[PDB]
Amino acid sequence: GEVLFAVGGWCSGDAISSVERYDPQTNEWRMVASMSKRRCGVGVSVLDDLLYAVGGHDGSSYLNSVERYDPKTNQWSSDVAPTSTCRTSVGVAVLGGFLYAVGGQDGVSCLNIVERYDPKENKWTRVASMSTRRLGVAVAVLGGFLYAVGGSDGTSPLNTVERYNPQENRWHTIAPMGTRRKHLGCAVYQDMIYAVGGRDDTTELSSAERYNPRTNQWSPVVAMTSRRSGVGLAVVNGQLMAVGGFDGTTYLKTIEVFDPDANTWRLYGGMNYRRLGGGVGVIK
């Protein structure tokens, strides 16, 4: 059974991020060990069955911090090289055994920076930058490409979608989403990229859409029950699930699971934590 981990759905005033664990087989949430470094706004992904947390900020200070969490020991380690730049709201994903850290924000601006981590060498390297500067980009990997979807330019949500080919070391701008989305969830499901929730220019979104690389098209997907900006999206035991988020009024303590046969999202209660969700990674 796969387990979902979620980092940073809540961040305390004193910069402690929540670290939550969800086992969908038993339907149990737990709090697990906090990161060693005080920080919020981390980006997370899973590499070799460890949860990596990259970047962030501690109040006004932006970080180059990297930590990795072992679910077998319930311990975070600070044994990894830091990134070369300090930045928050970075998008993280793994392609071809490297961990990529995409975009974000520092004191000065939103960023188009892309760095790659080689676990064999324990070294970060700048690779090709995105064509667009953006923070909080949602990342997904499909077909040998790394996708950078949506995000924000500092104020406004984006519909931009770019993908990176590591053999060419180049980003290419592809079909934009139908809606501008910051604070969105993105996950690969059934060989398509799903983008769910977020916030457009006017409102938090319940809407969803999916990208098919074969056709280079985004198509609308049936809406969730709730609007969810800040939503965590992941595939867990083969099921697409959206976690938490802000509906315009309040922070939600529910999840939704996509049921493609019924063509509906099924709503389930979660745990009454201060915030449910954050940056997500799935471990078996």
| CB-based burial label for 241 (10 Å; 0-12, 13-18, 19+) | buried
Neighbours of 225 (CB within 10 A): 15
- Residue 92 CA to residue 153 CA, distance in Å, equals 18
Strands 232-236 and 217-221: unpaired
Contact at 8 Å (CB) between 174 and 195? no
168 Cβ neighbours under 8 A, 6+ residues apart: none
Among residues 210, 256, 263, which one has the least CA distance to residue 236? 256
Q: Give every strand in the sheet of 254-259, ordered side by side.
A: 232-236, 239-243, 254-259, 264-269
Contact at 8 Å (CB) between 122 and 81? yes
Q: What domains can you pick out in the chain, each with its CATH number?
A: 1-284 (2.120.10.80)
Among residues 150, 157, 107, 148, which one has the least CA distance to residue 127? 148
- Residue 130 CA to residue 138 CA, distance in Å, equals 13
Q: What is the resolution in angstroms?
A: 1.6
Q: 199 pairs with which residues across the strands?
A: 182, 204
Total count of residues recorded for the chain:
284
Radius of gyration in angstroms for the set of CA atoms belonging to the chain, rounded to a whole number: 17
